[PDB]
Design a protein around this ligand. Sequence first.
Ligand SMILES: *[C@@H](CC(=O)OC(C)C)n1cnc(-c2ccccc2)n1
Lengths: 98, 80, 593, 193
Amino acid sequence: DVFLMIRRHKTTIDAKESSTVFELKRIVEGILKRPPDEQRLYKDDQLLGKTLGECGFTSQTARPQAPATVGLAFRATFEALCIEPFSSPPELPDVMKP
Amino acid sequence: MYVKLISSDGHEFIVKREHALTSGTIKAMLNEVNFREIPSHVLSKVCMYFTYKVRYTNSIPFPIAPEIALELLMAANFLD
Amino acid sequence: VSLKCLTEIAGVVSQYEEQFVTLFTLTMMQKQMLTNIRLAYSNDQNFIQNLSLLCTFLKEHDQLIEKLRETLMALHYMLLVSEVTEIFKICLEYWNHLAAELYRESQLYLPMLFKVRLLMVSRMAKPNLYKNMRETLVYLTHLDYVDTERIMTEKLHNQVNGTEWSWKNLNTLCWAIGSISGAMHEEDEKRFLVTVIKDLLGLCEQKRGKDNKAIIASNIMYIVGQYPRFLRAHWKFLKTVVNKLFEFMHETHDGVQDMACDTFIKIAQKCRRHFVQVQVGEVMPFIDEILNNINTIICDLQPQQVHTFYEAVGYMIGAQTDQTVQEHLIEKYMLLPNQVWDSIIQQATKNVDILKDPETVKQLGSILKTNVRACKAVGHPFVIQLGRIYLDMLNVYKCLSENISAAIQANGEMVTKQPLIRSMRTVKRETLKLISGWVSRSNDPQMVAENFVPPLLDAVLIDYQRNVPAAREPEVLSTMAIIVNKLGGHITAEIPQIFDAVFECTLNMINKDYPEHRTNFFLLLQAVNSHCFPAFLAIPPTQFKLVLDSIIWAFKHQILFTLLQNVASFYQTYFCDILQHIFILAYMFNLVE
Amino acid sequence: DADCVEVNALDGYNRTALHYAAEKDEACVEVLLEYGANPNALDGNRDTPLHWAAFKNNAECVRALLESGASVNALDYNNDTPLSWAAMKGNLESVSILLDYGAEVRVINLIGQTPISRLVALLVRGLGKEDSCFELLHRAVGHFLTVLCSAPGTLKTLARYAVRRSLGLQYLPDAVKGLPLPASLKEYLLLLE
Ligand SMILES: *[C@@H](CC(=O)OC(C)C)n1cnc(-c2ccccc2)n1
């Protein structure tokens, strides 16, 4: 298996490592209705037919409790990847500090 | 099939109704839900927890950080 | 000696109570002499022991002293001497007396009885002195169970803590714990047993060395063997200890197997009821499960251990009221002995020479020992196995006798003491013993006379008649007696031949000074006199005269008195002549008068 | 006897008077502590007075030791933490006190046992309040019977375990108060539910 995350702006969204990024794009199409040809995806900070195994996505790297992540863009011209980071947690109470 | 979850801070997440139903609160509420109190990081961690619970239901390897721990406890109390 | 004379004075009438008081005071005053009395004794001791005796003064005159109370609190001196086996026993006698008295009473002595309670547990002996200690202690616990449990837990912990780790202390404490059994109430029993079980398991896990673990396990097994009531309420721990004993049966160290087997059979007797029952959550009566595990459990056990395990299983089977399930239990239970027995019988029908193998006869002897134990445990329901093996067993017995004769002809009876001959004779004796067991516990002596006894006589009577006194096994007579006891009535028609073939030969062996044969003859003759006195009179006139002569030899060496009772020509023949021999008499005087 | 009682000297058994006091009563323990008895003295097997107190279930001695700075998770030569002994004997109260002091459940002794493992073994014997002790252990660990093993468990109890772990080796009942939590959740952290 390979559990994956995808992000774009404030918006967030698994397969087999043997699977390829195109079927993941098809999943993205079904979810958001932007066909794969108007989707482009980025592994790490790298703009991804590659099988998820050869994209670097591995189950040990892609567990459900620690899934992999991907950036997404659409043909608006594909926009520069815009992903808005999650809010940070507040200060840890001193009693809970190490 | 799918369901959308909005964090209090406006971050947005999508899963299958399947996983979201792991929360009793989700089942009580149900296409989309906005949690005007759950921050983005907590909501993302909860999505991870749903996926992990599904993947190891009646399987077990779950990480937690102290900073998010209290928020996670309160949010779990909220979401069953 | 001065003390002993005073002791005798104190040994002997409350009307002299003042004297009995003043004496006690003055001797107590003459404290002026006496401190570690145990030390003084250990390092003219006799004075201390005589001072202990005083013990019997208060056995009597504790009543007259109750009538100087601080001086009585003497009792401390009684403890001092108690610290000193003879002196300790002297003290223990009064301790038991006082404990029983105060217990059966329903305040003066209780404020310090705990001191004695501590003393008893400390000095507890291995299971008369032990009984007195046990009796005294159970009286004390009936005065307070709580303090007894507290003290036992304290010392058990000190052992667990390693503060006092010692085989001796462990053994004595466990002995006292076992002694308390029955005195405790069932709920307090449960609590205390749970505490002690956990503590013992703890010190078992903690301690290294298979020797230490072995002693701890033996103590645990003893204590559990002393508390069937708790085991019944905790059938879970009962199954637990059963499996643990199975484990110990596969041990090879310090005879643990034997010990385990011992423990096993004990509990097997005291809760047989429960094994034959489908207990809470059980798919089956647990006994059946054992009947399946047995093959494995015995794979490490020795023949005596096998006998003990079979006997316990037999008791448990006997607990099975349903004779159908009981038949199934017996079938499975004897199958392995039955299987080997069938193999031997098949080999015999292939060739008699199998019987002429020391190996074959030894296998048969093991089978017979197992069957004897099983019948002893089961009773009549064992009839199924008995009938299963009866005919081929008697054929084997006859073949054994034939081969005994075939050897004897070569050296006279001196073929005896040859190991094969010894084994064959032992096998015949055990066969007779098994027959005796079941027949004594037979349901229908008519059925026995129809199916069992006549073939037995065919195999036994004429053979014994033709045999030589050593091959003429005494047990035969015993068996016959038991037959007479059961087949009283039916047995009548067989009495003549029985005496024709056997009574003559044993009489030849009895008129001499074969003691077991002679004792069996006494009992068998009295049995014939009682059960079948009509047959007794019907004895042929020659054999009847020989019977009277045997009686004469006997009391010339109760049966005569029995004959006098029953017989009420004979008198003018024997009574007149026997009168001089005996010179009952009131009976004789009554008869003539 | 508190009235009857170098205090920290290890005796011929290599143990302190405080060990005996712990095995006997909390009053003597308190008197010794007042006289400066070291709670963390290690005996001939490096079992603390806390270890024996926990085994004896002398809960009052346990609380007195812990309140005086006892080493909650000291490891003897067998490396059995006092929780390990308390669990292997299966007594409840002292186990609860240890859990409130944040004793570590997830531990392994040289024997290769966990305290919950030993408690489970005791329960299997049918001798076992012991069910409540098992319940406290389960709530403290959150997840470790088969269903409780195959079930990943609630996110809630996982968060509770993480929070307690963060609180560390201090008195949890007092610490949880400072947390900005409803009284219900503060109680939940203390495994009272
Ligand atoms: C501890 C281990 C043991 O078996 O000791 C020796 C190696 C034989 N032990 C002793 N007795 C027991 C026990 C357990 C369950 C039921 C009865 C006795 N365990």
